[PDB]
Amino acid sequence: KRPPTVVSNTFTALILSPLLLLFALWIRIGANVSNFTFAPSTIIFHLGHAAMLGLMYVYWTQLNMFQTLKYLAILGSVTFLAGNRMLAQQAVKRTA
Amino acid sequence: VQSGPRTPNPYASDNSSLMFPILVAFGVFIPTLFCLC
Amino acid sequence: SRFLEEYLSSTPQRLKLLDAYLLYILLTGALQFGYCLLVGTFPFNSFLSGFISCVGSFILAVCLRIQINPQNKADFQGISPERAFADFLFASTILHLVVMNFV
Amino acid sequence: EFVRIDPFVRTFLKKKGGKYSVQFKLPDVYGVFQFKVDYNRLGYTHLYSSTQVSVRPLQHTQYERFIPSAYPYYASAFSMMLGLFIFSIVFLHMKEK
Amino acid sequence: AANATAA
Amino acid sequence: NKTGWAFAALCFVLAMTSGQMWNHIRGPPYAHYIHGSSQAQFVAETHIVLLFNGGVTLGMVLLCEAATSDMDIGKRKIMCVAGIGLVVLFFSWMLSIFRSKYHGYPYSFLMS
Amino acid sequence: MITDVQLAIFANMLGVSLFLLVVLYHYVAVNNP
Amino acid sequence: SQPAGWQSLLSFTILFLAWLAGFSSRLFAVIRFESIIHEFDPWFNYRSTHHLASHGFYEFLNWFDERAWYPLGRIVGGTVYPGLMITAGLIHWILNTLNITVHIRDVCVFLAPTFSGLTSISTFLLTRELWNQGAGLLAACFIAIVPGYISRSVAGSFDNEGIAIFALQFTYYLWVKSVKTGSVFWTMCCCLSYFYMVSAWGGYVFIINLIPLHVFVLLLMQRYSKRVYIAYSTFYIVGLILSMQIPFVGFQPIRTSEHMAAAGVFALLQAYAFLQYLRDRLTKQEFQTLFFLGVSLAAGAVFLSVIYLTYTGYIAPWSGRFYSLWDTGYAKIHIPIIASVSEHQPTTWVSFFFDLHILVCTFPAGLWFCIKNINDERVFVALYAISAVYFAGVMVRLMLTLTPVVCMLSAIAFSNVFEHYLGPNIKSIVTMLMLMLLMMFAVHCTWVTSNAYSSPSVVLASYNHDGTRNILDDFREAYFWLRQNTDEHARVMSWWDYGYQIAGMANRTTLVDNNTWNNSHIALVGKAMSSNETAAYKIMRTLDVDYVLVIFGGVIGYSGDDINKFLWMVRIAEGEHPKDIRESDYFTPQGEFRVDKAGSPTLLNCLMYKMSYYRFGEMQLDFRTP
Amino acid sequence: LLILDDSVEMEIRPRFPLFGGWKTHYIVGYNLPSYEYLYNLGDQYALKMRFVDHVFDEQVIDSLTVKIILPEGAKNIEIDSPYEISRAPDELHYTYLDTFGRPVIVAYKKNLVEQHIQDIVVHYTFNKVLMLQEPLLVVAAFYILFFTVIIYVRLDFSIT
Ligand SMILES: *[C@@H]1O[C@H](CO)[C@@H](O[C@@H]2O[C@H](CO)[C@@H](O[C@@H]3O[C@H](CO[C@H]4O[C@H](CO[C@H]5O[C@H](CO)[C@@H](O)[C@H](O)[C@@H]5O)[C@@H](O)[C@H](O[C@H]5O[C@H](CO)[C@@H](O)[C@H](O)[C@@H]5O)[C@@H]4O)[C@@H](O)[C@H](O[C@H]4O[C@H](CO)[C@@H](O)[C@H](O)[C@@H]4O[C@H]4O[C@H](CO)[C@@H](O)[C@H](O)[C@@H]4O)[C@@H]3O)[C@H](O)[C@H]2NC(C)=O)[C@H](O)[C@H]1NC(C)=O
Ligand SMILES: CC(C)=CCC/C(C)=C\CC/C(C)=C/CC/C(C)=C\CC/C(C)=C/CC/C(C)=C/CC/C(C)=C\CC/C(C)=C/COP(=O)(O)O
Ligand SMILES: CCCCCCCCCCCCCC(=O)O[C@H](COC(=O)CCCCCCCCCC)COP(=O)(O)OCC[N+](C)(C)C
Ligand SMILES: CCCCCCCCCCCCCC(=O)O[C@H](COC(=O)CCCCCCCCCC)COP(=O)(O)OCC[N+](C)(C)C
Ligand SMILES: CCCCCCCCCCCCCC(=O)O[C@H](COC(=O)CCCCCCCCCC)COP(=O)(O)OCC[N+](C)(C)C
Ligand SMILES: CCCCCCCCCCCCCC(=O)O[C@H](COC(=O)CCCCCCCCCC)COP(=O)(O)OCC[N+](C)(C)C
Ligand SMILES: *[C@@H]1O[C@H](CO)[C@@H](O[C@@H]2O[C@H](CO)[C@@H](O)[C@H](O)[C@H]2NC(C)=O)[C@H](O)[C@H]1NC(C)=O
């Protein structure tokens, strides 16, 4: 015997509540996105990362495992190259 | 039903034909160890 | 409040941000466990998937917190903070792939 | 009779057209089940027809998915994914003060 | 050393 | 200290690798000292084997403690030659009793 | 086809050569750190 | 000519020759007889691998075999470990995509030596982590020819263990490396390797229990660093969720009392590390004692929680197969199928010296050396050595998993000597003595592999006096008849030992298989095999059996026939039906089991006796005998 | 098997004796050298073999399928047979180190007898140079195996 649906919906909303608190606490601390030079590699990296996570959703919805592994491999190669390049530039500022 | 006597192998003759390919291999190897300069 | 006030003044900014992220993760995990207790487990596979996702991201973020803290340059000395962040991304990707395979 | 070692389901066949036909449901137990139709009467001949059939459990795709009772957990997982992404954009390009 | 009954 | 724990682990390993759990499940007689068949063993036989295994182990460790910068060259060389003789003697008696159990095994180092 | 004696001789000689190469490696590494 | 280049070339060459010696010492059953499978277990591995070749992966995951455990049916995809089958199928698919047409039985035969090479490489890496390369190369040369690992790895024996030892050694290497480095990447690689180990063999319990044990001893030795935290916590979480993926494992990492040491040490480690952080931040003079006491209380509370959850019934207790290793007398009394198998019996010193020639003697010396110089990894090595020695000392089958550590330790010891004396008379004599011991070891290993472990059980070989060998090929003869002269849906009844071999060779529906998961079915079969014809015929009618197969080794001198395995049938049938079958009934009033006129008339009318001795009282050999 | 001075007679004894309605299935193979069954001139080859070979005395065959597996570059193929055989369309066969399929000829026949042992010939054409398409693949493979190494020591992948 399963629980009533209203209870389930209420708990879905309550699970979505902590995200707002994180955002409120981050604007309490003062976290800003300021070091966002439009380098090719930074945009490519964040786009590939968002792409990989969207692929995770698409895998939950439709794809089987071999397809999602292949797509994840190609996205992981792209994101790996972009991230290597971006991380070196980020480290330059710290060392210099 | 039964075929008959087998055929002798016409392939090669000793002291020339057996060692000819091996000697071709050796003779290619040595000038390859000359392209150093 | 000495621990609280001292924590605010002593902790740098990136670490404080990471700590807020940890607070979010732990809150979501505790709320999920409370729902599971109130309602019971009909979809137990889904409960394992969700709660182990919460615990996994909590502990990967704690590992990043350890590796990036400048007071712990003594122990590691072989991995920069940026290698630490890349490793965090790798571990998180594998964890989420397994989670969506299991839910 | 729908038997495995001993009958799980016994029903009366019902006549339609020219055939005795019945429709029912297969029990929960998996295995190899066979239908025994045995007609034995006083004076008539002995009728016996047994056909073997295998009842296999559900495949991994035929399980129920997207159940309402588990809308929290799903949410939770995806929430944290979103969280992670936001965190990245705020952890690399953070401006010290 | 196999998966048989000890004889 | 580390020496006590090392010694305890070494003695546990030497005691267990000579088959003392066989003496726990199927308790054999002490003698009738070596059983004839390959599968069965007596009580004194595994004591003999434990003594020989500890002998070879002692020989190895003492042969390595003689090359480490120990005291003056006298005992430093006496321990070395003692290990040299000790390994070969105890291992030869071990191999010889093993050959005494397998009638087909054709090898012997210094059978004696 | 290979016999049993040929392959037994092969295994013995290969094991002996293996351990000779082990001792040669130890010699080289110790002598030239 | 830099000595570094030649040094690395020498290392590569010696690893390649170790690979080739490991591959070449495992062909003494293929040069002779035929390239087929040997033991009872590898036939099921073969059959399911063939299915995975001819139907794909998603058909093998949902595979409901109806041709085994006849009235019940066996869910194969969800009650087996898909690590050997998937590897064999992947190598088969890769090798046939390149148009190298190899049959899958050849891949199943020659899978094990190839993996023996990788096992040697893995030992090299794991020993290089503990000691200098020299010990690594020496350990890679030791575990390629050692008879303790060859036994259940020879070419043709296609079982779970050949892959399992590789995966175990590689997981241990990756965990040692992760603890040393402290990175999360090595912990992720270790988690993937642990997932592979879970999918391969049922020996992942050893890995998961050993890792908490190592971490706990690191805690007691006051050697807690941050790296141990970052290693073990990530390993446990990722490995737990990865381990739950296999269908046969399922939810056992929670319910079972084998996977509770891991959760215990995980909770204790979280508490310990939080308290230590607080200690660093708060004053040391005040609250120190409170921190010590809190750590102790957390550990005690975790222990109490585990005890309570095990006792109430939320956590299921140990399985009998893992409880016979502690109770040591629980097998023969209660569940006799555990004591029936030949593998589950203890080990004499003869096997310890017969599977390891000089390693079992210089192995405690290496352990002593490892204790003297202490590091985070060496504690782990010492615990691995002690645990493997004990576990192997009580069960013959398990000795294979002990063989790796022995090699490593022995290698270290030998390397230690070659460090000191190598590089006048005394040092030279020491070097020659050690080299001669290694020679004796190599010759012993070749002899043992040639004469002892290279023997198939499918084809029997009786040797003539003049050296000619005759092959008794009666198993395959009878199974091939059964394959091509019966109905397609015939049901054969046999003792559990051959359940696999009929379904692999003869391709017919068996009633009781080799894998035992329902003991009352085997009890029914035993009662049928140990009653008179009327009760046995009723039992055979209610199961729709057609044929009955009995192996009788009386004309030739064959040891294990069904009369020698009849008393275990009687005991297993007595276990579930005490009112019908009495063991004491098949003995003579003196109290012994015999076949003569002095035997009991309760056995002389049994069905096994009337079945394996039919029309034998007229079969007189030409040699003058009764 | 006994090697006579005209043929090779091998007595086959099955696993079990046949008694009526009992059947067996076996495979008998042999490979023989081509300097007595294949004749060539310039670019045109011709193979002359038996359609069905002796199996036992007074044999009777119910269904038969002969398959001839010519090498990869067989441009034209003609088959000359002494009686009516029913041949089906050609199908490719992929074997060790082959890029394009090698031609297979399939001929089915029914109700053979001990007197249908006759010779069929097949004419085909085959360029000689295409043979060294077989030693090249391996070479290329090894080159790729080396080229990986040449592209491996050219990668840095370090952040600092
Ligand atoms: C995998 O599968 C393959 C294929 O199945 C397996 O291979 C097979 O292995 C067997 C042996 O294991 C080989 O068998 C050999 O066959 C030859 C040929 O035999 C025929 O000729 C014999 C001689 O005939 C002449 O002489 C007689 C007078 O005596 C005349 O009447 C004749 O007309 C001829 O002129 C003849 O004796 C044979 O008859 C026998 O069989 C019939 C059956 O109907 C009986 O009635 C007869 O009484 C008689 O027994 C037959 O006609 C044999 O010569 C070989 O014998 C060798 O081995 C004997 C021991 O098994 C030994 O006693 C013999 O003296 C002889 O020894 C030979 O070898 C010695 C070295 O070992 C030499 O020193 C010696 O001089 C002699 O040369 C044998 O029986 C098969 O050929 C082989 N199959 C193939 C296709 O090659 C393989 O084993 C399998 N592998 C596995 C399972 O691992
Ligand atoms: C109550 C409890 C146990 C723990 C409480 C938890 C707390 C608070 C602290 C725990 C403290 C610690 C360190 C506990 C760990 C110590 C411990 C439990 C055991 C130490 C010795 C070890 C490592 C044992 C390993 C476990 C074990 C029984 C291994 C035997 C299995 C082995 C070696 C191989 C398996 C082979 C075979 C049996 C598998 C057959 O598979 P098939 O292929 O299907 O036939
Ligand atoms: C690198 C070392 C790893 C060694 C692996 C050893 C082999 C272990 C295989 C065990 C597989 C257990 C069963 C299993 O995995 O489930 C299969 C999944 O089917 C698969 O495709 C399994 C293929 C294995 C991929 C392993 C990748 C590991 C990285 C993330 C897990 C589910 O297939 P799916 O296609 O996901 O079906 C459901 C899809 N939905 C979207 C509807 C959910
Ligand atoms: C320092 C000098 C080193 C230089 C490099 C030397 C390397 C070459 C060594 C290879 C030797 C192969 C052994 C061998 O040839 O014996 C084979 C038996 O055939 C077999 O079954 C054995 C095959 C195994 C050989 C594969 C080795 C390839 C290595 C890849 C791992 C003889 O079989 P035969 O019976 O002669 O078959 C020919 C007759 N037919 C009718 C079949 C035509
Ligand atoms: C099958 C194998 C199973 C093996 C299980 C082992 C059984 C436990 C045996 C305990 C070992 C005793 C070692 C010990 O004394 O622990 C404490 C240090 O104590 C601590 O730091 C706390 C860490 C561990 C907490 C204990 C929780 C135990 C709960 C598990 C049931 C030692 O600290 P020390 O202070 O160094 O002790 C002596 C030092 N003085 C100078 C003070 C003299
Ligand atoms: C399922 C697929 C998962 C996709 C992965 C997504 C990755 C997200 C962003 C990754 C960022 C890459 C960072 C990176 O490349 O740096 C690597 C060290 O970086 C790492 O340790 C993490 C490597 C993770 C990628 C490995 C698989 C990627 C597959 C594409 C090749 C090197 O750092 P270093 O510390 O400089 O190591 C150099 C040491 N040497 C001695 C060799 C010089
Ligand atoms: C065969 O064995 C069965 C039991 O194993 C015998 O059955 C019993 O026989 C006795 C003899 O009087 C009866 O009293 C019992 O009622 C029978 N049934 C049981 C369950 O005990 C059977 O008689 C035997 N047949 C023989 C020896 O010919």
The Cα H622–Cα H599 span in angstroms is 27
Technique employed here was: cryo-EM
H interface with I, Cβ–Cβ below 8 Å:
99-101, 473, 476-477, 480-481, 484-485
Report d(CA C84, CA A83) in Å as an integer.
13
* Secondary structure of chain I in HEC code, one letter for each residue: CEECCCCEECCCCCCCCCCCCCCCCCCCCCCCCCCCCEEEECCEEEEEEECCCCCCCCCEEEEEEEEEECCCCEEEEEEECCCCCEEEEEEEECCCCCCCCEEEEEEEEEEEECCCCCEEEEEEEECCHHHHHHHHHHHHHHHHHHHHHHHHCCCCCCCC
Q: Measured from the CB, is residue H202 less than 6 Å from ligand 2?
A: yes
3-state SS record for C44-87: HHHHHHHHHHHHHHHHHHHHHHHHHCHHHCCCCCCCCHHHHHHH
Q: Look at chain D and report how many structural domains it folds into.
A: 1
Element (H, E) at H471: strand H469-472
HSE of H386, CA atoms in CB hemisphere, 13 A: 20
A37–chain D Cβ distance below 8 A for any pair: no
Q: Are residues I152 and I75 in the same domain?
A: no
Give the domain ranges of chain C.
Answer: 1-103
Q: How far apart are CA A23 and CA C20, in angstroms?
A: 9
Best mutation site among A66, A68, A80, A89 for ligand 6 pocket (most ligand atoms within 8 Å of CB): A80
Query: In angstroms, how far apart are the furthest CA atoms of chain A?
Result: 64
Q: Does H435 touch chain G (CB under 8 A)?
A: yes
- Cβ distance F13 to H367 under 8 Å? yes
Cα separation of I42 and H404, whole Å? 63
Q: Assess whether chains G and I touch, using the rule of 3 or more C-beta pairs within 8 angstroms.
A: no
- Total domains, chain I: 2
| SS3 state of residue D54 | strand
Phi, psi of H319 (to 5 degrees): -75, 155
CB–CB of H3 and G4 under 8 A? no
Q: How far apart are CA I47 and CA I124, in angstroms?
A: 9
User: Is the shortest distance between the CB of H477 and ligand 1 below 6 Å?
Assistant: no
Q: How far apart are CA H174 and CA H171, in angstroms?
A: 5
Contacts of I16 in chain H (CB under 8 A): 477, 480-481
The answer for residues whose C-beta is within 8 angstroms of residue H158's C-beta and 6 or more apart is H37, H42, H45, H46, H49, H84, H88, H108, H109, H111, H112
| Pocket-testing residue among A65, A66, A72, ligand 3, by greatest number of atoms within 8 A of Cβ | A65
Ligand 1 neighbourhood includes I27 CB (under 6 angstroms): no
What are the C-alpha distances in Å from H383 to residues A75, B24, F26, H149, H218?
42, 62, 28, 21, 11
Which tokens in the block code for residue F101?
A: 């159990």
In terms of Cβ atoms closer than 10 Å to its own Cβ (0-12, 13-18, 19+), residue H154 is buried
Across the interface, do D77 and C100 touch by the CB < 8 Å criterion?
yes
Q: What are the E-state strand segments in chain D?
A: 2-3, 7-9, 14-16, 19-21, 31-39, 47-55
Pocket of ligand 3 (CB under 6 A): A 59-60, 64-66; C 97-98, 101; H 61, 82-83, 86, 192, 195-196, 199, 245-246
Q: Contacts from C2-10 at CB under 8 Å and sequence distance 24+?
A: C3/H281, C3/H282, C6/H281
H187 CB less than 6 Å from ligand 7? no
Residue I62's nearest CA partner among I103, I20, I19, I109 is I109
Contact H141, H392 (CB under 8 A): no
Record the resolution, in angstroms: 3.5
- Substitution target in C23, C97, C102 with the highest count of A β-carbons within 10 Å is C97
Closest by CA position to H138, among listed H355, H414, H367 = H414
Taking chain E, what is the end-to-end CA distance rounded to the nearest angstrom? 12
Q: I14 and I82 in one domain?
A: yes
**Chain H residues in contact with E6 (beta carbon < 8 A):** 340-342, 345, 568
Determine which helix (DSSP H) or strand (DSSP E) holds A74, and give its type and residue range.
Answer: helix A65-95
Nearest CA in chain I to B2: I7
Cα–Cα distances (Å) from A58 to C46, C97, D80, H104, I121, in that order, read 18, 12, 16, 36, 60
Q: Give distance in angstroms: CA of G4 to centre of ligand 1.
A: 21
Query: In terms of domains, do I151 and I89 share one?
Result: no
CB proximity under 8 Å: C 71-90 to D = 85, 89
Residues making up the annotated binding site of H for Mn(2+) are 41, 159, 161
Q: What's the domain range around I4?
A: 1-126
Beta-carbon-side half-sphere exposure of residue H343 (alpha carbons within 13 Å): 15
Q: Please name the residue whose Cα sits nearest to atom 22 of ligand 1.
A: I2
H252/H243 Cα distance (integer angstroms): 9
Query: Which amino acid type is present at position D74?
Result: Y
Measured between alpha carbons, how far is H600 from H604 in angstroms, rounded to an integer?
6
C45 touches chain I (CB under 8 A): no
- Strand partners for I8: I3
* Set of chain E residues whose Cβ sits within 8 Å of the Cβ of H354: none
String of b and e for H392-430 (b: at least 16 CB within 10 Å)?
bbbbbbbbbbbbbbbbbbbbbbbbbbbbbbbeeeeeeeb
Q: Identify whether the C-beta of residue H113 lies closer than 8 Å to the C-beta of residue H190.
A: no
What does DSSP assign to residue F71?
Answer: S
Number of CB pairs < 8 Å for E and H? Answer: 45
The Cα H561–Cα H74 span in angstroms is: 27
Q: Please list every residue in chain D whose beta carbon sits closer than 8 Å to the beta carbon of residue H72.
A: 31-32
Q: Decide if F64 touches H, using CB distance below 8 A.
A: yes
SS3 call for H572: helix
The residue count for chain F: 112
